[PDB]
Design a protein around this ligand. Structure first.
Ligand SMILES: [Cl-]
Ligand SMILES: [Cl-]
Ligand SMILES: [Cl-]
Ligand SMILES: [Cl-]
Ligand SMILES: [Cl-]
Ligand SMILES: [Cl-]
Ligand SMILES: [Cl-]
Ligand code: NA
Length: 129
């Protein structure tokens, strides 16, 4: 599923991301835009052979099981395919564990490089939330 900007903002708000660990909704929408272009089915293979999955490009080296990442962990206790669903619940619940993990949103390289220090509130401007 490819979300609309405001649709995703509404979905992330209903799932508790709004100011989660102090990150305003626009931060998460900005991260989704640059990680996946709001496409739940986005995958990207890493040089180390891990794979990123879903709207927030969550990686198989730590967070989910794809059965092809030797010596990896499954800290969110989910099959990586769950992160590709039109239901963002698995993506949001796993994101809450990642963002709690000491580095906050710096864990998403595209958030640090493209959203941090920008006017992220622009990403939710004109949405009914
Ligand atoms: Cl957009
Ligand atoms: Cl915001
Ligand atoms: Cl594995
Ligand atoms: Cl594990
Ligand atoms: Cl599994
Ligand atoms: Cl949803
Ligand atoms: Cl933080
Ligand atoms: Na894994």
């Amino acid at each position: 599923k490819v979300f609309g900007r405001c649709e995703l903002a509404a979905a992330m708000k209903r799932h508790g991301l709004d100011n989660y660990r102090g990150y305003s909704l626009g931060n998460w929408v900005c991260a989704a835009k640059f990680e996946s272009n709001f496409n739940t089915q986005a995958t990207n293979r890493n040089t180390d052979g891990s794979t990123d999955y879903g709207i927030l490009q969550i990686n198989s080296r730590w967070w989910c099981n794809d059965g092809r990442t030797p010596g990896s962990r499954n800290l969110c206790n989910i099959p990586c395919s769950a992160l590709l669903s039109s239901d963002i619940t698995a993506s949001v619940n796993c994101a809450k564990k990642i963002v709690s993990d000491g580095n906050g949103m710096n864990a998403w390289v595209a958030w640090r490089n493209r959203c941090k220090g920008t006017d992220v509130q622009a990403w939710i401007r004109g949405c009914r939330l």
